Design a protein around this motif. Structure first.
Motif, PDB file in Angstrom:
ATOM      1  N   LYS A 114      30.775  33.552  48.302  1.00  0.00           N
ATOM      2  CA  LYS A 114      32.136  33.137  48.575  1.00  0.00           C
ATOM      3  C   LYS A 114      32.218  31.648  48.389  1.00  0.00           C
ATOM      4  O   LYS A 114      33.189  31.133  47.842  1.00  0.00           O
ATOM      5  N   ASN A 136      25.073  39.707  54.568  1.00  0.00           N
ATOM      6  CA  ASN A 136      26.354  39.072  54.843  1.00  0.00           C
ATOM      7  C   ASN A 136      26.224  37.600  54.531  1.00  0.00           C
ATOM      8  O   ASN A 136      27.155  36.982  54.029  1.00  0.00           O
ATOM      9  N   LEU A 180      28.310  35.176  51.918  1.00  0.00           N
ATOM     10  CA  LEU A 180      28.929  33.899  52.200  1.00  0.00           C
ATOM     11  C   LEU A 180      28.587  32.925  51.103  1.00  0.00           C
ATOM     12  O   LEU A 180      29.426  32.139  50.690  1.00  0.00           O
ATOM     13  N   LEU A 223      35.366  37.145  36.754  1.00  0.00           N
ATOM     14  CA  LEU A 223      34.973  37.027  38.152  1.00  0.00           C
ATOM     15  C   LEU A 223      34.349  38.325  38.620  1.00  0.00           C
ATOM     16  O   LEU A 223      34.771  39.402  38.205  1.00  0.00           O
ATOM     17  N   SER A 273      36.107  43.110  54.597  1.00  0.00           N
ATOM     18  CA  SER A 273      35.295  42.314  53.696  1.00  0.00           C
ATOM     19  C   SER A 273      36.039  42.074  52.393  1.00  0.00           C
ATOM     20  O   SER A 273      37.261  41.958  52.389  1.00  0.00           O
ATOM     21  N   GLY A 333      37.981  42.781  49.123  1.00  0.00           N
ATOM     22  CA  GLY A 333      38.895  43.889  48.885  1.00  0.00           C
ATOM     23  C   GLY A 333      39.551  43.895  47.527  1.00  0.00           C
ATOM     24  O   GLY A 333      39.586  42.864  46.881  1.00  0.00           O
ATOM     25  N   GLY A 334      40.041  45.050  47.083  1.00  0.00           N
ATOM     26  CA  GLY A 334      40.746  45.148  45.812  1.00  0.00           C
ATOM     27  C   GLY A 334      39.999  45.707  44.617  1.00  0.00           C
ATOM     28  O   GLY A 334      38.771  45.671  44.580  1.00  0.00           O
ATOM     29  N   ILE A 335      40.734  46.225  43.635  1.00  0.00           N
ATOM     30  CA  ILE A 335      40.120  46.822  42.449  1.00  0.00           C
ATOM     31  C   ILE A 335      40.613  46.129  41.184  1.00  0.00           C
ATOM     32  O   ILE A 335      41.819  45.946  41.010  1.00  0.00           O
ATOM     33  N   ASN A 336      39.694  45.728  40.306  1.00  0.00           N
ATOM     34  CA  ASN A 336      40.074  45.051  39.067  1.00  0.00           C
ATOM     35  C   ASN A 336      40.441  46.074  38.018  1.00  0.00           C
ATOM     36  O   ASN A 336      39.686  46.296  37.081  1.00  0.00           O
ATOM     37  N   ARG A 363      30.938  42.251  33.006  1.00  0.00           N
ATOM     38  CA  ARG A 363      31.902  41.387  32.348  1.00  0.00           C
ATOM     39  C   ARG A 363      31.491  39.945  32.505  1.00  0.00           C
ATOM     40  O   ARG A 363      31.173  39.499  33.603  1.00  0.00           O
ATOM     41  N   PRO A 412      35.042  42.826  43.582  1.00  0.00           N
ATOM     42  CA  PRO A 412      34.982  42.798  45.044  1.00  0.00           C
ATOM     43  C   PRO A 412      34.011  43.831  45.546  1.00  0.00           C
ATOM     44  O   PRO A 412      33.291  43.583  46.506  1.00  0.00           O
ATOM     45  N   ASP A 461      38.987  34.645  34.134  1.00  0.00           N
ATOM     46  CA  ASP A 461      38.469  36.006  34.074  1.00  0.00           C
ATOM     47  C   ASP A 461      36.955  36.100  34.050  1.00  0.00           C
ATOM     48  O   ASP A 461      36.272  35.116  33.768  1.00  0.00           O
TER      49      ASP A 461
END
Ligand SMILES: [Zn+2]
Lengths: 121, 148, 191, 104, 52, 156
Positions: free
Chosen positions: F51, F44, F48, F32, F1, F3-6, F23, F35, F30
């Motif tokens: 997204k 889900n 979408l 955003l 799904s 992913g990632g860390i700010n 934020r 995740p 910036d």
RNA sequence: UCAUCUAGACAGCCGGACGGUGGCCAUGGAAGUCGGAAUCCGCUAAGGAGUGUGUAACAACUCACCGGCCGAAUGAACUAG
């Protein structure tokens, strides 16, 4: 060659049975070689520890059955992973040492045979 | 409380290990040098014990180091980085002394065996005036008592 | 090399009864009954003691004694399928478009329909073979369970549902979308 | 370790499938807002070859710029710089073997 | 991203195969010979080319 | 799904305009949504929608807004659907949405917020502090078409 | 043609797979596993101065070896109908 090594094993076992009246059958599960080595060193003076293929051992006992007939009783106990301790000391002192040493997250004495008598202990 | 073991050529990374223990690199090096003042020419295991304030340095006995020391060696700068192949006299007494020094540390199987292992450790050293190291160890029973 | 006698055994539990005339096997158990025609394989059966049946071939070649162990495995699969049952768990795998799977009825035939597999407007329908029950499992996300007696029917229905969701004209090592069987076992596993 | 923290930060921004120019603008804004991890970075990022560049102090105020591959560890990048050192030495020895016969 | 376990399960059927060098057949990963007749059941097999 | 860390944003510890600790960046680059927050979304399908809103094309964004509004209309299903996380994500996306050049996008967005408030009134207090400045900015607008309905809706 | 084999072989599970020793050179490092040589003992039922994965170097995992279950033939290379 393979047979020769095997023949030596048969002979040493026979000598050990004769040498020590007290026999301890010890079951080893998840015991490291290092764990085993330490136990051997602690008991070097008073005990002999023998490890072998069971199929090999059973034949040997049957082969040596005519002499030392009482050792036949040990054969039912031989099944499963087993080790043989031959010791001058009669019973508890040896047993206490074996169980205590190297317990980590574990040697156990499944049966004791002394002087033709088998003790569950 | 914390023990750190390192193999150190004497007379002198160390800093990376030191930072975790919050110990000055220079201080550790000086302490190690003093310890290896005895085992400096050649690499030796050094044990540092940290008391949470300072680290105490001792040289743990090693078969290779003891054997290398026993072979008489002219001091080598090592700037040359030569092969420095080691050639040694039989030194039977020294090896027996080394076996005794080991004192069956780490459970060598027998006093004679400890010596035999010590002989094997001399893979590097010639270990005999005229023989392969430990070739005659099986042949001769002499010195078994000495090792004990 | 013409092995003159080779022979396998099948163990019959207490609950089942097996009836073998010529080469037609009927196994009857607690979950039901199953049958199998084996007139193509040319072996011989022999009941020993009402919980053991030997199957044998005489003067057989290499392929023939291979078929002997094959038919032993088939009749043993039938016995364990009528005792314990068979259960195949499959999982839904998607990247962006969620796969929407339901059960519909054209002329009362229990179709499984698959919608929105990689976002297409086409609706994939797979029929359901008889004797196979399908449950959309709770408490695990996107998991379907097919259970039955016949391993052939259950695994074939699971395979048809897997093959109906194949990706065309794309790199399938990157487009890993589909419905894949994750577990095979028994309905009463660890009995 | 701090290089590994910077790598983990840039890789976490990469794994969000974020646009590279927006990532560079995020680095500029955090440098303006005084984030140390951002301020260790140099802005012309070579993300096309999976390579970043980082400023390290020469004395434990001058800073040097070192290129780090994102797909290898910091120690592995250091071993690559050591390898480029070692390959340079062998060419120098080949030059020293060349010198006498060449100048003759 | 799918999930790590679900990528493993999908790659079990899609990526962890072998390819016959002669007839390009998609083969079991532990296979020794190709199952196809047209290449003559050859033992020239290669792993299926992964990404990354 | 998702992913990632700010990490950089997290060190900054700025809620920006937002007063709810989320934020907010009017600027496109910036602010955003995280995740993890998106992973946290209840549905889900909702994910979408988010997204789609993230996607650049105005039409796609517009389509997404519409889908969301219809869902909000079905509150009975959507009360369960609505999440605090959804609200936080919504606020973050909303900030960019108000700035939209397209009149329609802004107008729909303003209406959506108002619908959310009515359905969730008295349950949006934490969110209210953030929502009110943004909503107010939209209601009073130079353009009559965006402003007048928004204002009427605000009163309603 | 070599090997193993009811004194328990080959597949499959499960357990151990250790110390001298981080053996000697060489490297900023390389401790079985970047390389160069040697390649030996102890404890053994059994374990290579290492078969790979493996880290900056470690650590870790797996091997070829020995053991419980299995009880009987099997493995490699080659030849030609
Ligand atoms: Zn082929």
């Amino acid at each position: 060659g393979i047979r020769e090594k095997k023949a030596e094993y048969f002979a040493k076992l026979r000598e050990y049975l004769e040498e020590y009246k007290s026999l301890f059958v010890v079951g080893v599960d998840n015991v490291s070689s290092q764990q085993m080595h330490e136990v051997r060193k602690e008991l070097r003076g008073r005990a002999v520890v023998l490890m072998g293929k069971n199929t090999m051992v059973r034949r040997a006992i049957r082969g040596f059955l005519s002499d030392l007939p009482d050792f036949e009783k040990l054969l039912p106990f031989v099944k499963g992973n087993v080790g043989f301790v031959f010791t001058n000391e009669p019973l508890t002192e040896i047993k206490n040492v074996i169980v205590s040493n190297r317990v980590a997250a574990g040697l156990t004495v499944v049966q004791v045979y002394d002087n033709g008598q088998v003790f569950p202990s | 409380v914390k023990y750190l073991y390192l193999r150190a050529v004497g007379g002198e990374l160390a800093p990376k290990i030191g930072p975790l223990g919050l110990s000055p690199k220079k201080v550790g090096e000086d302490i190690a040098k003093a310890t290896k003042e005895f085992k400096g020419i050649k690499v030796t295991v050094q044990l540092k014990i940290q008391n949470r304030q300072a680290a105490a340095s001792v040289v743990p006995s090693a078969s290779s180091l003891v054997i290398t020391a026993l072979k008489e060696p002219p001091r080598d700068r090592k700037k040359d980085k030569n092969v420095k192949h080691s050639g040694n006299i039989q030194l039977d007494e020294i090896i027996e002394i080394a076996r005794q020094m080991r004192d069956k540390s780490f459970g060598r199987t027998l006093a004679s065996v400890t010596k035999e292992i010590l002989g094997t450790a001399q893979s590097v050293g010639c270990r005999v005036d005229f023989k392969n190291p430990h070739d005659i160890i099986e042949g001769i029973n002499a010195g078994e008592i000495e090792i004990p | 090399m013409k092995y003159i006698q080779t022979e396998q055994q099948i163990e019959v539990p207490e609950g089942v009864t097996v009836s073998i005339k010529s080469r037609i096997v009927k196994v009857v158990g607690p979950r039901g009954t199953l049958t199998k025609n084996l007139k193509h394989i040319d072996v011989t059966f022999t009941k020993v003691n009402n919980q053991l049946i030997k199957v044998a071939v005489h003067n057989g070649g290499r392929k023939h004694v291979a078929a002997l162990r094959t038919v032993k495995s088939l009749v043993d699969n039938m016995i364990t399928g009528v005792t314990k049952g068979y259960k195949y768990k499959m999982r839904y795998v998607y990247a962006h478009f969620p796969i929407n799977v339901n059960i519909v009825e054209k002329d009362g035939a229990k179709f499984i329909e698959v919608r929105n597999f990689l976002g297409d407007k086409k609706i994939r329908n797979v029929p359901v073979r008889d004797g196979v029950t399908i449950e959309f499992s709770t408490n695990v996300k996107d998991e379907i369970v097919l259970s039955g007696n016949s391993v052939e029917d259950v695994s074939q229905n699971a395979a048809d549902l897997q093959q109906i969701c194949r990706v065309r004209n794309k790199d399938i090592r990157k487009f890993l979308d589909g419905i894949y069987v994750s577990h095979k076992g028994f309905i009463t596993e660890d009995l | 370790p701090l290089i590994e923290e910077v790598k983990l930060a840039v890789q976490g921004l990469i794994d969000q499938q974020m646009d590279w120019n927006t990532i560079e603008k995020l680095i500029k804004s955090e440098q303006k807002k005084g984030n140390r991890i951002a301020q260790l970075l140099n802005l012309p990022l070579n993300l096309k070859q999976n390579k970043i560049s980082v400023k390290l102090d020469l004395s434990s105020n001058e800073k040097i710029n070192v290129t780090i591959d994102l797909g290898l560890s910091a120690y592995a990048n250091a071993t690559e710089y050591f390898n480029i050192k070692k390959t340079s030495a062998q060419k120098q020895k080949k030059v020293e073997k060349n010198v006498g016969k060449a100048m003759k | 991203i799918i999930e790590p376990s679900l990528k493993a399960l999908a790659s079990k059927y899609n990526c962890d195969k072998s390819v016959c060098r002669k007839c390009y057949a998609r083969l079991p990963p532990r296979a020794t010979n190709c199952r196809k007749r047209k290449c003559g059941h050859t033992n020239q097999l290669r792993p299926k080319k992964k990404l990354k | 799904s998702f992913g990632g860390i700010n990490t950089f944003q997290q060190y900054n510890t700025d809620l920006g305009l937002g007063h709810n600790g989320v934020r907010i960046s009017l600027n496109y680059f910036d602010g955003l949504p995280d995740p993890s927050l998106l992973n946290s979304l209840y549905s889900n399908e909702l994910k979408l929608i988010f997204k789609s809103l993230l996607k650049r094309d105005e039409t796609t964004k517009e389509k997404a807004l519409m889908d969301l509004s219809n869902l909000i209309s079905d509150f009975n299903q959507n009360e369960y659907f609505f999440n605090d996380i959804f609200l936080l994500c919504w606020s973050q996306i909303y900030a960019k949405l108000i700035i939209s050049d397209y009149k329609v996008i802004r107008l729909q967005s303003h209406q959506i917020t108002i619908m959310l408030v009515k359905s969730l009134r008295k349950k949006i207090s934490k969110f209210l502090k953030d929502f009110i400045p943004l909503i107010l900015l939209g209601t009073c607008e130079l353009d009559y078409s965006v402003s007048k309905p928004s204002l009427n809706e605000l009163t309603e």
